[PDB]
Design a protein around this nucleic acid. Structure first.
Lengths: 114, 64, 274, 87, 95
RNA sequence: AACUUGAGUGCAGAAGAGGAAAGUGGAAUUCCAUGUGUAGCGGUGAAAUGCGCAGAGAUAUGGAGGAACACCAGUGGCGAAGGCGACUUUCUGGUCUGUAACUGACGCUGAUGUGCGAAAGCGUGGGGAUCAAACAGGAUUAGAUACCCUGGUAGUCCACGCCGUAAACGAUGAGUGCUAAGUGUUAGGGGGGCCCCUUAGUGCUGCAGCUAACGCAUUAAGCACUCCGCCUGGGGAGUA
């Protein structure tokens, strides 16, 4: 394409899955922190998210991407480093919307640890 | 602070009055706590009912 | 409802019967009754083809309107009656200008309710109208499969299909088994579930009461001789000594799918059950 | 339960004198209509246990008012017991 | 005695000739069985706060009725459910 | 025989997730079908089982089904208690305020009795998304039939019945009256947005007084009167 390809970032307490798709929800490329050789307790780190984002960002430029919408889904440590890893590659981040699903109840949350 | 339902004298909040309700729904349609809006306990209840009626009739967003 | 007999006899301990309270007239009509001479499993040659079928109480056939096609003329329910040839009850209906005919009794159809066939009909229990005009989500019984043939699908006590959606010339319908399928839109149904919803909860009790509906005893194959059945023979009681339970005529019986392939209905079954 | 207009005709029917609302002939009669109304409600909503509890309090109030009336004068007790259908 | 306000939404793609055919008939049941409809207002094609059956807009009609039978409003909701033109309705007892 | 203050009724008002039935919604989870998509996903303290390469995870659209109702939401409200939170309608219970129109003690408590009664459990018939006793593994340990992880059955949901137990607790029976205050909040009333007075709830400090102490203190565990239930060292034993 030319531009307007949204990027979905899944930052959790584990690896950060970063995927770059077009505006109509068609995946171009993707790169998680686990696909970069990162071991556990490395996967959920700001450093790993930095390479995780730009690794998929370079694959986007081959299709000619000049506009990204950052849709972040998850409460993970590697969120902000991921977004600054997209501007550092020159992807012209327009919007920062959080899409972490919030149930209006209606499901039994899995039991917590002990 | 002042209630706006006692100050101006409104004794019946109408769910068709979307403009009046949009002052208490914040940025998501989320009902604002009465501490933030300063409406009394008596009117926080009939305002919540009006808001929920408007949401069902698509006069106010559930989320935004 | 179900009446539980008191254990006055052993052969009658756990027996149960239908209270027959929804029925209102206990006698048929001379002009909508034709003869049914029991055949008992025998064919055009005279040989037993289906088994476990024999003597039973006589029964008169009651002509039913499965093809509800009197379109426009209204009809009054005169009496809900008992039918011996089916699980559900039948209801006499008198049409607004003189003719009378039987139908299948829906769940809460009451005496004196009005029913209408047609295409401009309302969506109420009993009225029959084509599947192009039946809203998505309605319980329907007596569903046709072919335009004008007559209801075939869903006709036994407690049978109900749900119109679930559309395609082009076919409507999607979830039949009682759990199968979703498609039926041509120009075919008729009838709004509502069929009555006698408690027919499935009855207990028979007596051997003879099962031997009054025309059932005959069925012998377990594990006691016939080797020349009578695959499971037969053995000195003593024996397990099934084969890789699979078998049928009298030599064909696997616990799992083998016996639906002819290459049928002209395969393009119409979406998901299946049973 | 019973509407206010419905209650008034019961008041007028069994009032001892004019402007009487508290005599144990109108109170008993009003409760009888009220009791039958909740009884009719519970024919459909059988498991309305919370409403049924208020019915038992009304029955007790009428029973105590009937005991008081009988202990005061038996004539008015006999007239009230037959008009209302109370056994 | 009892006063009801009925608001229903009609799909925004209805044919204009059919709109008066539907609004007429549906205020028709609201005047049956002792119902004496007082107001019958049109609110116009407003924007819905969210998509309803893949619709972004819709016609709003508000009808106020008064009757001590309540079966007029029940008959409305029974037919409003069946009709594919009405996509949302709500009956409020107003006192 | 007489009387209204007790108790009830009448009239004018008030608030409420009080209960039952039937409908209508939005978010989310799961599964299914496709489009894009490529080598991981997931999880831990580290793992691994596990799901993937037969295309998983992710992403977009659509569909099916079940369950619960974010924000409002609070020492907030209602109910005798258990308990009751999406919205609408229909039936329906209780409570509070004011008035003083009516009856003139019609009241309290209450053995036996008769009903209601969280979860779990049972029967019948449905339903089954999520979470899951038990069960399977994978780990940690010296061992781990446990905490951790991966799944997973009954159950969790509905309709009828049955069960009748909970740290069912304010660990505080019900009714009535009296006895310093201060300051809140909920629902009303009357006077001169503010102030004063007042009724009923719900809170926090705090006098007298009580207590072994902790503490209670006008919502007593103080001062009095009526009625019921219960206790008489610990085990054996809530067992015969």
């Amino acid at each position: 394409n030319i531009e307007n390809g949204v990027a979905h970032i899944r930052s959790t307490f584990n690896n950060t899955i970063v995927t770059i798709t077009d505006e109509f929800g068609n995946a171009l490329s993707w790169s998680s922190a686990g696909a970069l050789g990162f071991k556990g307790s490395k996967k959920s780190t700001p450093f790993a998210a930095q390479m995780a984002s730009e690794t998929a960002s370079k694959s986007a430029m081959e299709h000619g991407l000049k506009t990204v919408e950052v849709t972040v889904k998850g409460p993970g440590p590697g969120r902000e480093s991921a977004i600054r890893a997209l501007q550092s590659a020159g992807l012209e981040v327009t919007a920062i919307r959080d899409v972490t699903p919030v149930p209006h109840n209606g499901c039994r949350p899995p039991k917590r640890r002990r | 602070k002042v209630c706006y339902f006692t100050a101006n004298g409104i004794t019946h909040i109408d769910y068709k009055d979307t403009e009046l309700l949009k002052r208490f729904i914040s940025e998501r349609g989320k009902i604002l706590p009465r501490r933030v809006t300063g409406t009394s306990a008596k009117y926080q209840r009939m305002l919540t009912t009006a808001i929920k009626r408007s949401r069902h009739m698509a006069l106010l967003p559930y989320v935004k | 409802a179900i009446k539980k007999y008191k254990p006055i006899t052993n052969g009658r301990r756990n027996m149960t019967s239908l209270d027959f309270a929804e029925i209102t007239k206990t006698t048929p009509e001379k002009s909508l009754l034709k003869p049914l001479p029991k055949k008992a499993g025998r064919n055009n040659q005279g040989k037993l083809t289906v088994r476990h079928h024999g003597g039973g109480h006589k029964r008169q056939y009651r002509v039913i309107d499965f093809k509800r096609n009197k379109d426009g003329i209204n009809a009054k329910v005169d009496s809900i009656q008992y039918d011996p040839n089916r699980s559900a009850n039948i209801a006499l209906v008198v049409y607004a200008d003189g003719e009378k005919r039987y139908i299948i009794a829906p769940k809460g159809l009451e005496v004196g309710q009005i029913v209408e066939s047609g295409a401009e009909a309302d969506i109420k229990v009993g009225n029959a109208l084509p599947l192009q005009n039946i809203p998505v989500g309605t319980v329907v019984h007596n569903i046709e499969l072919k335009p004008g043939k007559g209801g075939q699908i869903a006709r036994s006590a407690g049978a109900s299909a749900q119109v679930l959606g559309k395609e082009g010339k076919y409507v999607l319908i979830r039949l009682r088994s759990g199968e979703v399928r498609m039926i041509l839109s120009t075919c008729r149904a009838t709004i509502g579930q069929v009555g006698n919803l408690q027919h499935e909860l009855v207990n028979v009790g007596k051997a003879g009461r099962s031997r009054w509906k025309g059932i005959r005893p069925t012998v377990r194959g594990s006691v016939m001789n080797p020349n009578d059945h695959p499971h037969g023979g053995g000195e003593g009681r024996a397990p099934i000594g084969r890789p699979s339970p078998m049928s009298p005529w030599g064909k696997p019986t616990l799992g083998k799918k016996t639906r002819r392939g290459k049928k002209s209905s395969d393009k119409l079954i979406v998901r299946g059950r049973k | 339960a019973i509407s206010q207009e419905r209650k008034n005709e019961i008041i007028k029917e069994y009032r001892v004198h004019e402007t009487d609302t508290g005599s144990p002939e109108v109170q008993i009669a009003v409760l009888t209509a009220e009791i039958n109304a909740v009884n009719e409600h519970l024919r459909t909503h059988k498991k309305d246990h919370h409403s049924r509890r208020g019915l038992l309090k009304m029955v007790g109030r009428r029973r105590h008012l009937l005991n008081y009336l009988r202990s005061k004068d038996i004539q008015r007790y006999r007239e009230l017991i037959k008009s209302l259908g109370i056994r | 005695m009892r006063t009801y306000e009925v608001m229903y939404i009609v799909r925004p793609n209805i044919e204009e000739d059919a709109k008066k055919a539907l609004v007429e008939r549906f205020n028709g049941i609201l005047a049956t069985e002792g119902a004496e409809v007082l107001e019958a207002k049109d609110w116009g094609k407003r924007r819905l706060a969210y998509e309803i059956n893949d619709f972004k807009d819709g016609f709003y009609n508000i009808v106020r009725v008064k009757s001590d039978n309540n079966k007029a409003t029940d008959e409305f909701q029974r037919l409003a459910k069946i009709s594919d033109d009405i996509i949302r309705y709500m009956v409020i007892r107003e006192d």
